[PDB]
Structure formats: structure tokens, C-alpha cells
Amino acid sequence: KPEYMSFGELFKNSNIFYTPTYQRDYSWEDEQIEQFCNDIQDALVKKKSKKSCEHFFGGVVCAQEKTFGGHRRIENLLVDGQQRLSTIVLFFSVIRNVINSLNCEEDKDSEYRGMILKDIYKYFYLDERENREIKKHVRITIGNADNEFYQSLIDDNPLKGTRNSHELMLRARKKFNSFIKDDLFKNRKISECLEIIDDIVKLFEESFLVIHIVTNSIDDAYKLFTGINLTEGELLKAHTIGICSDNLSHQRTISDNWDAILKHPSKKVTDYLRWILIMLTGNNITASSVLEEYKKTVFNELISKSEIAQTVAYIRDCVERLEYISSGEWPFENNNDNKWHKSKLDLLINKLKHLHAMPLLLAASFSSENNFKHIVNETSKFFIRCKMISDLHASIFSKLYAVLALRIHKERDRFDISKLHGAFNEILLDKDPEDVRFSTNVRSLIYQKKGDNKPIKCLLMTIQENWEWLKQPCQGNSLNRLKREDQTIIFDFNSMTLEHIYPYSALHEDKDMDMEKLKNNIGNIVLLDPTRNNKNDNKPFIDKKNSFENTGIGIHSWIYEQKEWTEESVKKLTETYVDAAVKVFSFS
Amino acid sequence: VKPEYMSFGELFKNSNIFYTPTYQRDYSWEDEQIEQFCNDIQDALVKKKSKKSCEHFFGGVVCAQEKTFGGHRRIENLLVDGQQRLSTIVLFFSVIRNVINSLNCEEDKDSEYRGMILKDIYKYFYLDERENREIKKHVRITIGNADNEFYQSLIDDNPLKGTRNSHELMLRARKKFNSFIKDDLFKNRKISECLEIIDDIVKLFEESFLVIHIVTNSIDDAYKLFTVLNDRGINLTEGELLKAHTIGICSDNLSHQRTISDNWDAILKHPSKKVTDYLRWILIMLTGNNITASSVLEEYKKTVFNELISKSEIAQTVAYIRDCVERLEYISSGEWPFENNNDNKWHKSKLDLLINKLKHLHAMPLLLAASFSSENNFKHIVNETSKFFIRCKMISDLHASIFSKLYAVLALRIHKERDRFDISKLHGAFNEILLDKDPEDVRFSTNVRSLIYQKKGDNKPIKCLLMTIQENWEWLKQPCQGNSLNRLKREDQTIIFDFNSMTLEHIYPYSALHEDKDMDMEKLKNNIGNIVLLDPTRNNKNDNKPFIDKKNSFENTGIGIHSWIYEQKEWTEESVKKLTETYVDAAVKVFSFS
């Protein structure tokens, strides 16, 4: 059935290729350039026996093809594949330059070299006659920052080179020379040497294929895979400037702000833009539709008052913050010690990798620093209960955080914390009526023999930090809990100690054969004190009691009181945990 | 100059029969995918009231082979990308069809506008194969083993009861489509108006909602078109693809097919990214030749899953692949892989640093191979690698390819040598790189020298440095011996620093009161020569006041550089210069492997 075409065919036909405006810099590194050569050689090797067909880079995606509006005969707005075609040309400039310097005394420069040279002419130029003049254009033109220098490389008279991409090209060529001269020519006579290049020419003609896909617009091409060449950032840079046509001032402001955004690499740009939008709109917009939604909501004509110019600058500022918050780091200046909350932000996204919260936090950062502080803290507690302890589907977070994120964006410092609780509370009533699913889970928590034990550690740590408020006689309201919570201790999971009250590993003297069934149950587990008290304990309860004498951790009191630790005392702690778990992870 | 497209309707007007590949992944769209599917419909409906309503959705339905000569129905299509979009159209029409089950016999529109629109839309559900004697109408979309049972039932409006999370998603999708047409669209509309929009719905899926049908040559090829950067409704990964290829080799010994099939099943439990990442890091370990993401499918096929290796080892490897995948589940998130009974907390903290705090994923093939070595060899690698990464990436900024070969080769050597590997190899390996990229330590040295305190960050670079010289201080001081193995033996493991509670003090004060504000010194204030770590426990810094009124901080403390600082009379530009050199010197010694 299917129709495929070789790379030669792409250049055989009268095609001219050119990149989009805002085409990203060349990005092929040695990993790509080696693979490009080794692909060749596998197929040279296979030549001796079996087939060399390779479906290279299936898909050279083109966005328009004007036969009367071309650059020369058929313009192609290359959306994906530019690198490959670009380098292929580069590679052939190397084949031409190596060959041209071969000795070639007898019947080669006379014959075979010239026959090879006409067959690759097509990778460099396309001749066209108007009357008596043979005007001839180049077959591929790359990004604006690069093209000038690339062309230089193809003319084998390179320019100096002003940036990374220029260099990345220079190395690929350096590598190509080594690949032909050293790795393929090796030790061979000119006739043996041409024979192998004639096979390279023939590979690109017959064996190396792609699917040539034509498309109606840049956006449609782009939609085929929603980012070596174009991100949403580049498309928005373009759209956004195109909106500010008359005002040549607003443009330069915008171009600059986008360039600062586009510096950062593909994945992070797109992910930031998504998060930013989710905030602004208050909807869990899907990855593909981000490009579309940006234009419908944030960048449009009713919108289009050169507010867009302001918004672009707002995007940058958001990006500058996200570089802190995406890596778990505090967005505000360091003076306020604020270490305890700083420890939460790190926990929340470096340790538990709860990125969903991002638009929340971003919007939070545009509120007050106290707000940010409380939002981070609480949003942890939520995530812990909801997905560390319970295993709810993450879609719980999607819609919740988006409205919140939006709320906070409008309300800023007049945003009040209580909104967060009610918000969290709603959701938790719906999915957990009487704090009964949360409870059953906390109850069925087992210590892990291999983990860092995040889920148990999160639970203990947090109740401990909200212990004082647990034992305050009445009300225990969540807003009071947030005012009267312990921030003096910054718990490190790496140095946290999780004690087995009935010992983890007991020998014959310690016995209790059917207490062994009980160990690992949460009820047989306490957070030891990491305050200077040093937890070098392996023994039975009676022996190891000094561990709980008069220490900073709340539940240690009642653990001391026990003359012995039995099946029943395990049940008695389990419920104490399960209880405070509920009061401490509930919201009002 | 005109490019080809086709609508979802044209797709279905032809005599197509769409099916998924074997092992096609479970249905994965959630409320954000469907809330978009719907908002797409209404905007086009709102744009119908003025301008054009064209819209290129899921451009790129990609089939793998075609047969019309002899078909189950006329034309059969193996879908490798598109299924999920096409499936929630069949779903969404089934929902319109039950919403035209609202007004029975009602006023000359049933046989006119309801019987008609039923048949104009009949096409998404069944394709009438008239056949030799008996009419055989088949369903026009099939979606791989897990769902198809439950799915077929739902469109019919005779739903089964869910057994998987996927089953719920479709059930939610149905339920949300219900609500849309009745509450968003039909909301106070004369049923004449209502039919008018149901009708104008089909017209979009006829004329306005386009795609690009691509026909590929093989499944591999269809997948190659997705080699780079697509993330929604993944129907396959290298994992699923590899399961077929590996089964296809181990077929005529069912013993292997069952053990194989169940392992990949266990593997393929994990979400696709983790799967393709894990698969690469293992291949790298198995070859010692770090290989482009874009080539993992093939390099698995001509290396560890070839025909000359068709020795039933294949099934043992696939099992091994799963051993690794279990391990990688821990290491990947910085969590210790061994039985954590034997405390080893300090090294645990270094793994969490390396993977969760500094994010040096490049190391996974190395870390993985080491986990198959002694837990000692593991301990030491995580340690020494964190040293090398701090040096090369956090302080210096050598480009990440440096690591790519270095680790690939090391991971093999560790895989091959196992528990009788010796650390001095890892040091040598590291040491060769530094002899190459930084022969006389001058690059690393100046980078250290020009480290500045950050007004906003966590200061991870300066912290990585001061903690690490701090932790190796009794070795920096000893009557000099200078051996990397020596350092490793003598190294302090008694404190476990938490970046969140670690304190960086400016020796000349951060914000100095004018009475104490020397101006030449301010040009230095944030330079590392004026920065020191503080005893985490014990003393806590709160004070931005002058050196002299501030000397109590260093007196009899746990951290070595304090002794010298205590000994000063004043804190001059000259004393700064001196410290810089000390830090530069400590670094060069603590961060080398000779």
C-alpha cells in the first residue's frame, strides 16, 4: 500500500526547503552525528549480503507548497526534519570536499569523480533558466541566526562563528571528515574510495526513506505531535508580535521577553507555559490545546490592546519564579529565615514530586509570602493524606488546584487561607464521608524493608509537628492548628529514625513468636527523637525504654508509661495514630 | 499547493475496519481530554453562527497495514495512533443516539428527523456487510483486549460493570457527554432547536473536523514517527513492542512464552515514561555503549534479543530486565535498594542528594550496575559519583555528554565484574576525564573562586562544597598523605546535613549597619571568600552584625574551618583572600580521584 520516498527523491524533485521564522538553533550533538554515521555503516556492511533499507526519521513534515508562490519552484516550510536534511546537505558538502582533494591522476577526475559530482549537485543547488540566465538557489535554508554561517560551511569557506550552534555544526563536519577519511577510506586506493562513496550516494537515493507529509499550516504540522525546532513559546512569540503590527515599539519589548523565556530548554518552556495558563484560566487545560487556548483566551483582539505586551512580560516573571519552585526552591529573598516552610516546599516537590500543585504555588507566590508559606504547608498535608496515605487518582488535583490557582491570581494578598481549607474540605467530604477511607488506610500501613519509607515518615512527622494542638482540650479547629503548629524542628527523612517498639529483628531470647506477626504494623512503630538523643537501640521494650524518657516527641509519653508492650498496646497506638491522623489531615 | 486532509466522517463513510495492535495499552483519557473534546464542539457551534468552523483534530491517524482484497470486512486498518480519539467519537455519538431517545412519536419529527439522523449516524457503530446470504454488520472500531469487551457494551447502551480503572474513564466520558448535550446545549431549547444542533453536530464531523490519515509500512515504522515528543493517550511503548518481538522468538516453547508474557506484564504495569527510561538505562548497562533514545527499540533487537542468542536465555534476560525494573523503582526516586536494616543512613542521604536534590539521572545505568555489586561498592559509588557530579556540574558546568560515555562503559565493567569490582577503578575512570578536561585543576579552581552567594536560591552549589570539604576535614589536616582511597577511608560519616537547616553566614555582615560598613569589603560581601557553613546544631546564626561582635559563633564548634576563623583579630579583605584559597585548596583535594 504505502507511498514512501528516499532522501535523494526529496532533492531529485524541484523542492526548495526553508525553516520557519523563529526556528530554534541547530541542536544535533555527537550522539546524533555518530548515530548518523553508524546508520550509514550498518547499511554499508549489510550491503555485502542482505538489504540496507532504513526508515530514517520517517516523517519530513512540510506546511505549505506553493508551485507559483515558491522560493524557486516548490517552497517547503519545513516544520520537522530540518536538522536531518540540513546535516545531510552538510554531510554531502564533506563528501564533495574530500573527493575533490583525492589525488586522481588516471581516469577518475577524468571520469568517475565527475560522474559522482553531478549526482550530488542536487544537494547543493537547483538550477533554473529564465531566458539566457541560469539563476540557481540553495535547496535548504535554516534558521535566521544560523543560516549565514551554515551556508559558509557548505561553501567550504566557513565564517568565524558566533554561537554554540555554529560550533555544533563545525564539529559535525569535523566528525564527518574523520568518518570518511579515517573510518571508511581508512587504507584504500582512490578507486576503492570512490566505490564506497558511490554506494553512499546510492544509499541516500534508494535505501534511506522517509514519509513526506504535507500539511496546511504551521499549527497543523505542529499539532501532529502535540521540540527540537519549534515550541509553543516560538509560535506565541510569532503570534504575539503579529498582533502588535503597527506598534514597532511593543514588538521589541516582546521579542526580548520571549527570548529570555525561550533560552530555557524545550520540556521546561512548554511545561511552564501550561502551568501558567492553568493558573490564568482556572481550567486543567490539556497539553495539546495549550497553543490553541493561549490564542483564544490570553492573546486575542478584545484582549489585543497591547495588554498582550504586558502579559508577555508577566509570562517571563512567572517563568523566573518557576525556575525556583520547579526545583523545590524558595522564590522570595533569603533574609526571613523561614526554614521550616522552605523544608516543606523541598519535601513537596523534590521528595514527593507532586508537580500538580505548581499553578497553585505560582499563583500563591503572587499572593503574600505568609500565604505562600501556609499554602505550601497545607497543600502538602492534602497531598499526603490524598495520595501518600490514600491512593486516590491524581485527577482529584487537576480541577481543584486550577480554580484555586485562578482565585489566588485575582485575590492576591486579600486571598484568605480559609478558602483553601473549604476547597480541600469539599473535595474530601465527597470522596471520604466520615474520614473512613483515610482511616482504614492509615490503619493498614506497613513498614517497608527497602524504602526510605516516605508514607509512614510523612504521617508521623506531621502529627508530631501538630502535637501540641492535638492535646489542647477543646475545639482543635484547623485554623487554630495553623496558628499553633510546631515549626522549630526541620525533619530530615535521611536521619529520621523509625523505631520498631517490639524489635524489627529479634532472636531466641526475645521470642514472642506471634508478636512477630504484629511487627511492621503501624502500631508497632514510632518516630524516635532525632534531637540529640541518639538511637542506638536493638533490644526489647523493657531494655530500650530510655529511648522514650523525656523527649521532644508527643507520643513518647504514653510509650514510657507502659510496663510492657503487647498485642493490645499495638492496637492502642494504631488508634491514637488513626485518630490524630484524621484530626490533623482534616480541614475545619 | 493544496494539502490533503480527511474528516472523521469520510474516514467512516469508506468501508474501514479499525483495530489496535496486540498489547495496545488501556484507555487513558480523563476529564481534561473529554472536557476539551466537548469545548471543541461548542466553539465550532458558536463560530457556525458567524464565520467558518474548521478544526484539525488529532491530525495523524496512523495505520500500519491495509487489506481490501480479503477482509474481515471490506477494508481493514491496524491503528497505531488515533484509536483513543476515534473511540471517544463512537462513544460520543452513542450518547447523542440515546439523547434522541427522548421524544417518542413526537409531532411529525420521528420518522422525519430522528429516524433519519439515526441512519445518517448509524455508520460509527456498525458497517453493514451484506455478504453471501446473511447481512453481517460489524463494529467499526476495536480497542485491544482489556477494554473492548466493556467498551462494545457501553456504546450499545447495555453497559457491563467496570473491573479496571480504564472502565471508569469511559463510563465518566459517557456520563459527561450526557450532561453536555442536555444541560449545556439543549438547556431551554424547543426540541426543534435541539434536533437543529444535533444535526449541525454531524455536519462538523463531516466537513469541519479533519485529520491526516497516514499509512505506514510496518508497526516499527508507525512507531518511528512517534520517536520524538508526543504525550497523550499512548497506545504503545518500546516495552509492549519488545514483548511481541521476544515472544515471537520464544513461541514453540510455551514454558518461556508464559514466564516471558507475565514479566513484561509486570514491567508494563509502570507508566510509559518510566518504562522507556528504565529500558534505555538497562540497555546502556548491558552494552556499555550509551545509545540514543531514538535507537533503543533496534539496539535491543540486534544485541540482547537476537536470533544467534535464541537460546532460551532470552526468557532469563526478560526476567532480569524485571529484576532491574524493580531496583530502578527505588534508585530512580533516590530510595535505597538494599534491605535497609543495616542502617547506612549517611550513604542513603547521598543517594537522595544525588537523585532527588541534584537530579543526576545520567548516573542510573551506573547506580543500577552497582546495586548488583556489593552494598559496599554501592555505598562508595553513590558517594564518589556525588563528588564527581558536584565538581563537574554544580560548580563547573561541563556539558552533560561527558557523563554519557563515562557511565555507559563503567556500568558495563561493573555489570561484568560484579561484587569483585574495586573502587579504585571508578576513581581511575573519573580521574581520566579530569586529566582530559581539566588537567591541572585550573578550570575547577577558578569556578570555585568565583562562586557567589545567592540572594534567592537554596545555594546548592556553595552548600555542596562546604559540606563536602567539612566532611573530609580530618583528612585535609592530617600529616599529608594525599590518596583518594585514603580520603575515602578517613572520611567523616557521623553527621547527616540537611540543606534546609544548613546555615551560610557572611563573615563581614550581610547587611551591615552604616557604623560598621566598610565599602571595599562590600564589593566582596557575597563572594565565597566571605562565606562559611555554621554548626547545624548548637549555634544558630540570626545576626547581621560585625565580625568582632560576632566571634562567639566559631569558638569550639564541630566544623574545622572555624578554628582558623576564630583565630583572626579582624576580618579584612586580606583574610577573605586567604579563605578563598583554602576553599580552593580543599576543593581540589576533596574533589579529585588520583
Residue numbers in the entry:
A (entry chain B): 4 to 229, 235 to 596
B (entry chain A): 3 to 596
Paper text:
Although it has been confirmed that iscS-dndBCDE and dndFGH form an antiphage defense system, in this study, we found that a dndI gene, situated within the dndFGHI operon, also constitutes a PT-based antiphage defense system along with the iscS-dndBCDE module. Sequence analysis reveals that DndI comprises an N-terminal DUF262 and a C-terminal DUF1524 His-Asn-His (HNH) nuclease domain, similar to the domain organization in SspE. Upon sensing PT modifications at 5′-GPSAAC-3′/5′-GPSTTC-3′, the ATPase activity of DndI is stimulated, which subsequently triggers a conformational transition, facilitating the dissociation of DndI from self-DNA, thereby allowing DndI to avoid cleaving self-DNA while restricting PT-deficient phage DNA.
In each asymmetric unit, DndI forms a homodimer, where each protomer of DndI consists of a smaller N-terminal domain (residues 1–238, hereinafter DndINTD) and a larger C-terminal domain (residues 239–596, hereinafter DndICTD). The conserved D83GQQR87 motif, a key motif for NTP hydrolysis, is located at the junction of the α3 helix and the β3 sheet of DndINTD. Unlike the typical HNH motif observed in Colicin E9 (39), ScoMcrA, Cas9 (41), BrxU and Ref, which is composed of an α-helix and two antiparallel β-strands, the HNH motif located in DndICTD consists of two β-strands and a loop, showing similarities to the HNH motif found in SspE of Streptomcyes yokosukanensis DSM 40224 (27). The CTDs of DndI and SspE exhibit a lower extent of structural similarity (with an RMSD of 4.9 Å for 325 Cα atoms) in comparison to the NTDs (with an RMSD of 3.0 Å for 219 Cα atoms). The immediate finding was that the DndIY25A variant with a single-point alanine substitution at Y25 still exhibited intrinsic ATP hydrolysis activity comparable to wild-type DndI but was no longer enhanced by PT modification, suggesting that the Y25-containing hydrophobic patch mediates the responsiveness of DndI to PT markers. To further understand how PT modification modulates other enzymatic activities of DndI, electrophoretic mobility shift assay (EMSA) was conducted, which showed that the binding affinity of DndICTD with DNA (Kd = 0.66 μM) was 14-fold greater than that of full-length DndI (Kd = 9.31 μM), indicating the inhibitory impact of the NTD on the CTD.
